[PDB]
């Protein structure tokens, strides 16, 4: 999405998107837990072993 609707990138048919040439990368010691349908947690609160995300 861009400033003006013109520079906005529109998918030409179907395919796969890939991000390249980052300005910088930042690594964080953490553990990634992907989901599918919504979320029961909220940004910023505390979690514990066994807790349902």
């Amino acid at each position: 999405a861009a400033i003006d609707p013109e520079e906005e990138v529109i998918a030409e048919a179907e395919g796969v998107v890939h991000l390249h040439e980052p300005a910088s990368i930042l690594v964080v010691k953490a553990r990634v837990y992907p989901f599918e349908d919504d979320v029961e947690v909220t940004t910023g609160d505390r979690v514990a072993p066994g807790d349902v995300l």
Binding site: I3, A23, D37, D38, V39, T42, T43, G44, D45
Partner: protein, 345 residues
């Protein structure tokens, strides 16, 4: 030292690249519109959901436990809203997180341009607010420039921010400054006058005159108006100003007390309150009363003829004459005894 302190604390964070800036304003406004879209969902206020976001972001029960002894109920008007917006479909749910992160970025923006605000208020020293105090009032004038910004205008946030920094600073200096309080426009008009003074004193080389300085000011300005507001210009004087060539002297103690009776004054008012009593005794019983009812010597309040007449049962005309003969009757005894001929100042 708080001085170097603030500078180093703001020097703990990098500024922003043009990219970071544009992106900041973007996500910020996406959150601000997200809340607006949430108001159309659960049917709540624009600012309600807004602040309640900070209630889970800006902190735990510390945000609503001290905005004064009263702000808005934390367990009641908020907690119900923290769970009312909690049961919504995936469609509405995301617009919440966009509000949390969106409103979050705002802080980043402020923190970023803070290294600007501090460097702005730097040229304003002398107002009577030492740096940090001066800078602070300016920092809040950043918070205004932020929420009202528009990235779409393709303008560097600097230009928009700076004006709102100077606004806030110039507003605090007219609302604090001098010990006494000065309404804003008038504070400015002072500055305008001095601004002219130091100008035509510069051109003509000799200091101006109350008439010519007002002349160069505009219409309606006269020799008196300038001196008039000039009187109000100057502030009070420190009572701690040492007087004389010594180190043991002050300016405070050199001020008397008129708000309290002097012993001679107590004795004076006593002599009048007494001598008048005995001088009162020599009058007709009805007129002796009516007399102290018309001077407010009884209940401290004065009773008009209408009341006195209703007190005895006579008319408002009779009482009137009663006073005439009363005072004039004590006249004779006073022109003799001369005890009360005094108290003439």
């Amino acid at each position: 030292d708080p001085v170097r302190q603030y500078l180093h604390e703001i020097g703990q964070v990098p500024l922003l690249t043009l990219e970071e800036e544009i992106d900041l304003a973007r996500k910020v406004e996406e959150g601000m519109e997200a809340i607006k879209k949430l108001s159309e969902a659960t049917g709540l206020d624009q600012e309600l959901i807004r602040e309640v976001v900070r209630a889970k972001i800006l902190g735990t029960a510390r945000i609503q436990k001290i905005p004064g002894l009263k702000e808005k109920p934390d367990p009641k008007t908020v907690e119900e809203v923290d769970g009312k917006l909690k049961s919504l479909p995936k469609e509405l749910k995301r617009y919440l997180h966009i509000a949390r992160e969106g409103e979050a970025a705002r802080q980043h923006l402020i923190e970023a341009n803070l290294r600007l605000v501090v460097s702005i208020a730097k040229k304003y020293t002398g107002r009577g607010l030492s740096f940090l105090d001066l800078i602070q009032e300016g920092n809040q004038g950043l918070i205004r420039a932020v929420e009202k910004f528009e990235y779409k205008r393709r303008f560097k946030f600097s230009t928009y921010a700076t004006w709102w920094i100077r606004q806030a600073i110039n507003r605090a200096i007219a609302d604090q400054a001098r010990t006494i309080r000065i309404p804003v426009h008038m504070v400015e008009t002072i500055n305008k006058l001095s601004r002219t003074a130091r100008q035509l004193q510069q051109e003509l080389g000799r200091e101006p005159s109350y008439e010519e300085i007002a002349e160069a000011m505009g219409p309606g300005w006269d020799a008196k108006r300038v001196e008039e507001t000039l009187k109000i210009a100057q502030e009070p004087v420190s009572l701690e100003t040492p007087i004389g060539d010594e180190k043991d002297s002050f300016y405070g103690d050199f001020i008397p007390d008129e708000n309290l009776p002097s012993p001679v004054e107590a004795a004076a008012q006593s002599l009048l309150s007494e001598e008048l009593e005995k001088a009162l005794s020599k009058l007709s019983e009805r007129e002796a009363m009516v007399l102290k009812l018309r001077k407010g010597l009884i209940d401290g309040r004065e009773h008009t003829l209408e009341e006195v007449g209703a007190y005895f049962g006579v008319t408002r005309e009779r009482i009137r004459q009663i006073e005439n003969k009363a005072l004039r009757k004590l006249k004779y005894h006073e022109s003799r005894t001369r005890k009360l001929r005094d108290f003439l100042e």
